Structure 1
Amino acid sequence: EHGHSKMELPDYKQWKIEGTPLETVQEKLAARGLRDPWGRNEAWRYSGGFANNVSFVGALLKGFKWGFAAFVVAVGAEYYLESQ
């Protein structure tokens, strides 16, 4: 059992420099009269689910919302239990 499902590649017209910092790179390049020949090639790294990035503190704080809710529930329960 191996991965034989006949994968098909996407359409090459989908990848556009627009919406990616490569548009800024192109603007800086044209300010000198230059143009990147490989701009559309890499644009997929900015198009799909990788378009949304997360910060360092956000990465460190991966499960604090749920853990904080669990903690507040637990401390409330302990406070209501020991006060008896």
Structure 2
Amino acid sequence: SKMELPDYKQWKIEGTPLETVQEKLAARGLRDPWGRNEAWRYMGGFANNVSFVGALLKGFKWGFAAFVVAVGA
């Protein structure tokens, strides 16, 4: 039984929210996070999911063409 478990030393965190909070916490003077545990929660097929208004923008990124075809009908 294999699952093959995509391993460590792969993330190398680099991400924008954890990077900003590490820099803020370093300028605060702590420099002791948990680690890179949020990287698979942050990037991959993640990392620029759409905002609120874009979810309503999803409605008309394909329907205008068919609507103008139906008006021309």
TM-score when normalising by structure 1: 0.74
Aligned length: 73
Give the helix-richer structure, 1 or 2.
Answer: 1
Q: Which residue of 2 aligns with 1:18?
A: 14
Among residues 25, 31, 35, which one is paired with 1:29 in the alignment?
A: 25
CA RMSD in angstroms, aligned pairs only: 1.6
Q: Percent identity?
A: 99
Larger RCO: 1 or 2 (CA < 8 Å, sep 6+): 2
Q: How much does 1:37 deviate?
A: 2.9
Instruction: State whether residues 20 and 43 of structure 1, in contact with CA within 8 Å, keep that contact through their aligned partners in structure 2.
Output: no
Where does structure 1 lack aligned partners over 5 or more consecutive residues? Answer: 78-84
Q: How much does 1:9 deviate?
A: 0.8
Instruction: State whether residues 17 and 43 of structure 1, in contact with CA within 8 Å, keep that contact through their aligned partners in structure 2.
Output: yes
Where does structure 2 lack aligned partners over 5 or more consecutive residues? Answer: none
User: In the TM superposition, what whole-angstrom CA distance separates every residue of 1:15-59 from its partner, at most 9, and x where no partner exists?
Assistant: 222123100000001102112331311111122011121021111
C-alpha distance in 2 between matches for 1:53 and 1:69: 25
Instruction: State whether residues 15 and 47 of structure 1, in contact with CA within 8 Å, keep that contact through their aligned partners in structure 2.
Output: no
TM-score when normalising by structure 2: 0.84
